[PDB]
Design a protein around this ligand. Sequence first.
Ligand SMILES: Cc1c(C(=O)O)ccc2c3n(nc12)[C@@H]1[C@H](C3)N(CC2CC2)[C@@]2(C(=O)Nc3cc(Cl)ccc32)[C@H]1c1cccc(Cl)c1F
Length: 94
Amino acid sequence: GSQIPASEQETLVRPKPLLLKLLKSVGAQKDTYTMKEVLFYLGQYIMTKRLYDEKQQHIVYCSNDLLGDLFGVPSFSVKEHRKIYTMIYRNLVV
Ligand SMILES: Cc1c(C(=O)O)ccc2c3n(nc12)[C@@H]1[C@H](C3)N(CC2CC2)[C@@]2(C(=O)Nc3cc(Cl)ccc32)[C@H]1c1cccc(Cl)c1F
């Protein structure tokens, strides 16, 4: 479940306030982005907060970070792209 159509990646989206705060924390100071750009910046967020040092396995543990509050989960797999898109879609305006 790691494949996402280009059309979804390239669609413009408006993050809700908590997602916007996470994006601004890594220097993304816009209110409209493509989904791919959101995923780029959230990847940089994960790395900057040291939530993925064990790169030879797939899990991000986020129960002690605002990312866990945003996604509503204690952990997730980086390979499960569809599940991640669903969790981000719950944090977009309409
Ligand atoms: C597909 C695949 C496999 C595999 O094939 O076994 C194995 C590892 C993978 C990894 N990603 N894809 C992987 C990448 C990357 C590690 N990760 C960052 C992490 C390093 C810090 C990403 C990333 O770049 N941005 C990001 C943002 C969030 Cl919120 C959550 C996970 C990631 C992932 C990813 C990229 C494109 C769209 C999606 Cl939806 C997505 F989740």
